[PDB]
Amino acid sequence: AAKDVKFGNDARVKMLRGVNVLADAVKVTLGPKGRNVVLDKSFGAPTITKDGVSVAREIELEDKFENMGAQMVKEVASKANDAAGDGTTTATVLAQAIITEGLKAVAAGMNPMDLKRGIDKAVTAAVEELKALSVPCSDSKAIAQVGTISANSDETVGKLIAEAMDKVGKEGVITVEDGTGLQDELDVVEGMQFDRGYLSPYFINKPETGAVELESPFILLADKKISNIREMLPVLEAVAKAGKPLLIIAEDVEGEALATLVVNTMRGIVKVAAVKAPGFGDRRKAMLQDIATLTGGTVISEEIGMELEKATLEDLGQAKRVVINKDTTTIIDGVGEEAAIQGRVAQIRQQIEEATSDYDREKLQERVAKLAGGVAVIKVGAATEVEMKEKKARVEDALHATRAAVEEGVVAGGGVALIRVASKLADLRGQNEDQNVGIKVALRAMEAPLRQIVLNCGEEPSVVANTVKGGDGNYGYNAATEEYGNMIDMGILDPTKVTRSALQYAASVAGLMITTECMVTDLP
Amino acid sequence: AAKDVKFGNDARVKMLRGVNVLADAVKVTLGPKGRNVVLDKSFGAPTITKDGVSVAREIELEDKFENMGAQMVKEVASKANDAAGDGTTTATVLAQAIITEGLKAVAAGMNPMDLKRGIDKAVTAAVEELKALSVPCSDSKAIAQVGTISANSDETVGKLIAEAMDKVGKEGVITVEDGTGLQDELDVVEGMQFDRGYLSPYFINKPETGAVELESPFILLADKKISNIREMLPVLEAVAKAGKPLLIIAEDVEGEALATLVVNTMRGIVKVAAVKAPGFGDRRKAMLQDIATLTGGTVISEEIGMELEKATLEDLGQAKRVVINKDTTTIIDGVGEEAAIQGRVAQIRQQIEEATSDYDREKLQERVAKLAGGVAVIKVGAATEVEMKEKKARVEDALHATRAAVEEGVVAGGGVALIRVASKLADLRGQNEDQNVGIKVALRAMEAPLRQIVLNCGEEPSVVANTVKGGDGNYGYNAATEEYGNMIDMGILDPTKVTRSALQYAASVAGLMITTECMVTDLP
Amino acid sequence: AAKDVKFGNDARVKMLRGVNVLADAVKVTLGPKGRNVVLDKSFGAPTITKDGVSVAREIELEDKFENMGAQMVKEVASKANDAAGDGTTTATVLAQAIITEGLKAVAAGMNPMDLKRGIDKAVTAAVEELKALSVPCSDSKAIAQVGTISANSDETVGKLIAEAMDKVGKEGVITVEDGTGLQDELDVVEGMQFDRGYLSPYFINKPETGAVELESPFILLADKKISNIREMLPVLEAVAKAGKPLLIIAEDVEGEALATLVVNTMRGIVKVAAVKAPGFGDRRKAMLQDIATLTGGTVISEEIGMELEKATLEDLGQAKRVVINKDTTTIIDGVGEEAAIQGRVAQIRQQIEEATSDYDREKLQERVAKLAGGVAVIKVGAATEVEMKEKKARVEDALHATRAAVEEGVVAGGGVALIRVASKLADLRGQNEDQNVGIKVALRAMEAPLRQIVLNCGEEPSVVANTVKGGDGNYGYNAATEEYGNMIDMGILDPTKVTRSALQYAASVAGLMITTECMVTDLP
Ligand SMILES: Nc1ncnc2c1ncn2[C@@H]1O[C@H](COP(=O)(O)OP(=O)(O)O)[C@@H](O)[C@H]1O
Ligand SMILES: Nc1ncnc2c1ncn2[C@@H]1O[C@H](COP(=O)(O)OP(=O)(O)O)[C@@H](O)[C@H]1O
Ligand SMILES: Nc1ncnc2c1ncn2[C@@H]1O[C@H](COP(=O)(O)OP(=O)(O)O)[C@@H](O)[C@H]1O
Ligand code: BEF
Ligand code: BEF
Ligand SMILES: [K+]
Ligand SMILES: [K+]
Ligand SMILES: [K+]
Ligand SMILES: [Mg+2]
Ligand SMILES: [Mg+2]
Ligand SMILES: [Mg+2]
């Protein structure tokens, strides 16, 4: 359709107005004393949230040029959420500061591309300084402190996440989902477990708990649809002679074979249970081979040149306990050599290194956890559903921040690390005067998060900013208790990855946004 | 539908208004100090661009006569993009200058057809002068300079493209795609490679890298669907006696034959890998014949009169190394006579000479690169997605400019070549006074790009243009560093093809736009 | 729906307003100094045309009585384009002049039917005078001059058309298509050629050019389906004994016969190529019989009572060379007696004389051209697409004018022939005074084209008209150089057919339009 075309300062003013609208909506939720935003939903009740990307993803304006400005600045928060899972409000605050100062410098007669180059140079130097300023985060106390800070100063969430990380291990998986009561609970599983249960209720040998218990059984791993029992007679006779229980993992067991097995169980001849293989497609084969490696067995498939009639005792894996119930199967203390397990997990790790999407990496890491580490689930408890959603979001944020701190270390929080970096970069110079102006723009915009944090508390940002800048090291301002001190001692920690990512994406979007001269959109 | 008819000066005023709207939208992005344009997208985020055709393709006007003018001038940029891939803003600037001066002459009582004829004569003479003025671009330093200038003065892109062109050769192919990191990378693959992987995971003999590696194999090229093992026993027996691996490139293999092959693999009988033939249809046959000529083998086809059971060791190709992964297959150092490869590439070159669509030519050039040269891929790295899109567009422009400069030579940049040509054409004359006026119109319009480049810098175009006109040779004006000097020494190079194409298309459209007397369009 | 009814002078002024609008849109493009008209297209870009019928076909008006007038006067241009292919602006100018003068006469109280009868009488006498005034046009110089004049004074177009007409001969056909370069080229084909290529790439015996070449082949013409080699075997063995190649033109060939033929090809047994028959249906039989009578063979069909298995060397045609490629087949120097060719072309001529649509006549003419003369194609080259379209239209107009001038002769151009005729018809009288008034109306309207040509030049039409009327013979006015002289020596020629058609159609529509008294249309 027809277009509307604007040039120069008019387009820049519309774009800045849209950016300011989105940023002012988002920045009320920053810090320990930030407040909540209510977001209307078409299908359901409103959501009360304190998360920056959640607020940013629903801001849209009726003016089309202002909406273009807002849509451009929204990508900073979206990309920060995708990268680190935290630090999105800080990214938006930095982007708005850079855009405002850059437009003010452009209107003074500077070349926008030289300003962009200066911003790029300052940001590269700042990221180098941040990496040199980081400190490792290894003890459980520091992980608890990071999880507490990220969950809006909540001691219990940090303590729970620290305990979960301690029990599960370095190669495990922790997940968050909705609970039932009013308290948080942590359920950890050791060993391997998949969401497939027994195929016949008569298999139950312990009616008290409604579960199948087997002691030191054999595991028959068959990559084949089992329908006729005639294929199953040799191994059945073998295990009957041996006298130990048998577990059959296959794609399915049909009516007559299942009937034969169940009839044989309750007569005291053989102790048999049968469950279906987990997953759909090639992943089924992968986890079948994982179980085979764990229990020291062999997968009986027709694509390798084996038939189940020829299966013998050494082809059956062995475990210590198998617990099957209506929904889950658990294999406990599988008998398998450590070398094979390490080789398999190494193969999965190098497979992880060559994965693109999040879904594949999550599945592969879950497989590594099943083979080697553990899997935990955190249940969030709240009285109402809105409180449940808000607490679940906070817990997920704390989980992400603790992970990032584990990979890349921690720096002093509260906006002090960026101030220290900007004070260190005071002698950085570029090629020409416009690049110097851009460097100064970036360095001055690095002080925005602390000023906004102090502003949300109702105090005077300039006095606090000058007092913090007058110090050195980890000297900072505690916004919760309104006192100065050492932020490392007070337990106010931020991951280096979150800070660095926020700075990088903010600069990347803002530098491009500064250079606009013309702006084209549809007519009202 | 009912129409609106407008005559003479009113029609010309509306047309010039539309042309001016589109040209002023496009011309803010010209030079080293041009800026960006934000284009609103219905599906997604806004697009920030500096490319002329991208801006031109979006402009539309609500008035209908003005929209006719804009739609008519848009074809200059479209044609320049399709022909050379670069120089669209310069073409638009030249078109607008010619249209403005020509309408000014027509309003003074000149015959538009004679003005058109004079403009065409001047443009023909100018193209001859430009061809007489160019210089070869053969060493890598000049290629780097051209790629740097065409990428908004980005040295790294120019050096990367120079290295890629050095490695991949004269007959190679270079493509640009999205990366994942923050740094650009170049990955060149030598030899022939196709994107078809192994047909069964059990074929892998190197689990550490997950690759199927074979040393000096036989290659069996079956242009048919392989159904039963029985058709293959003679070949397998011969290869097993021979004692070296065998690679089966066929249309596909089902469960039975593949099961037999895989069973034989790990038993130590014969080392065999199977992959699917690349392509779909006739191109599949062409690729199979290319592999046959490269490796020195024969394709087993029913339409030629041979069967798989009759195949011998003479119909099998040979190589030195074959590496297969989950997605790619690589044939390294095929053992074949160079004469056959030269004949095949000459035949494909002849096929190229009679190729119309660009897709077919691209596929044929990729096939020639596989046979004779290499394939290089440049992966662009950026922090966000808008930055990625801009960097990718600039890298593509630099690639096109370097190709054009290699094929046709380079002239002085900055709009200096056009000014030198116009100064050389100072005594050209036509048959009557209107033709002379048209010649002068074209000569005056040839100075527009330099004036616009100086205008975007905040300088005065008149003084700079006069000073440049006062010099001779490669003397010019550097807009980045704001000084005068030799354009060749300071590295501002422009392909002759881009300049010539821009001038030709601009004149071709502007001359016809000048001769309009009536306009017919729908009612509002 | 409800109707609106207007009576008398109101209806007549509405009609004249519509006529004036369309004619003023059209007449700006008349003469050597007429201009271009931009026509808006809903799907694509606007077209810049100088063709009168093209301008007329897109005129429609919001008012409904004015739209009736425009829709009525549009038929003159449509009919003139359909008949002669040229001279539509002149027809519209004549129609408007007649309508204006006739309405002026009617307003003075004269019977419209008598005016119509007088106009018809005058036009009949004028057409007789035009037929008597013509001179033959057979020289290549005169054909070049006609093509130059009709192509808007383009020497190259006239020269190219003259050369093409000389090469193809009297009975040949010439077509115009889009070229690829910037220069026009002429591509003439000698012999017979049809657009069917080889059925298998392995028939190629010259792979440097990728074409099949046979020297002194045998041509097997079979109007049947061939799938099994059993009915093909005896003639194949006979050809193998003969020792010379064979070309099979049939309906098509299935896999069995094609595989057999190709298998015998590269073994050196028989040099065989197979193609499909041209055409679909009865026309396919017609071209099969044409090839048979050209090469001196017999068509094998079931509907005549012959079988392929019974074929001998007598039923096989013979040629001197056959070249086949991906798309075209050419038979060079067929061995046939010219009496058969003459009889066949005579049969097709009598078929031509009894053809209603132009499409069947075009196919029959192409068949005669393939039998006797040649087929040429002119490729029009231009830089852009708008220039391409306008140049192609001009070339087609020049081709139409050249054919018409060959058919019926030439007269002096610039509107001088009509003036001479009108001067010769000064003594013509009717039955009553109103018929005499109608005759004078027609004679006055015959002077409109020269007046409009002079008006488009910026000169004063009345003085030029009187000076031309004062002369005699071919004395006229040259609007290109603004000079008087002999129109024949200056090279300004028009076909007699075009002038006669324009006059006839203009008078035919205008006479009816004069006699209106009431108009009935829908409500606005
Ligand atoms: N008690 C505190 N004193 C000072 N600063 C704090 C305190 N708690 C948190 N902060 C700072 O406030 C910021 C929290 O902002 P938040 O609302 O979580 O937005 P984001 O989505 O960017 O994390 C952190 O960067 C942290 O440095
Ligand atoms: N440093 C420089 N000094 C002077 N002129 C330059 C410099 N760099 C590029 N140019 C000129 O600017 C033009 C580049 O225009 P650009 O914005 O790339 O549009 P396009 O490539 O579409 O024509 C070229 O004609 C080139 O001669
Ligand atoms: N050099 C010339 N001097 C005078 N008359 C000319 C000249 N060239 C062409 N003409 C006249 O102009 C007319 C061409 O008008 P044109 O635009 O072709 O309209 P049409 O569609 O009726 O052919 C011809 O009738 C021809 O007699
Ligand atoms: F404006 Be061009 F695409 F460099
Ligand atoms: F306008 Be006509 F077709 F010469
Ligand atoms: K927040
Ligand atoms: K540009
Ligand atoms: K015309
Ligand atoms: Mg956080
Ligand atoms: Mg460019
Ligand atoms: Mg004409």
Numbering used by the authors:
A (entry chain B), B (entry chain C), C (entry chain D): 2 to 525
Source paper text:
GroEL is a cylindrical complex of around 800 kDa containing two heptameric rings of 57 kDa subunits stacked back to back. The apical domains mediate substrate protein (SP) binding and the equatorial domains mediate ATP binding and hydrolysis.
Encapsulation occurred following the addition of GroES and ATP-BeFx. The remainder contained only a faint, smeared-out density, representing empty chambers and chambers with incompletely folded or misaligned MetK. Class I (around 40% of particles) contained a strong density in the chaperonin cavity, corresponding well with symmetry-averaged folded MetK (left), whereas class II chambers (roughly 60% of particles) showed a weak, diffuse density (left).
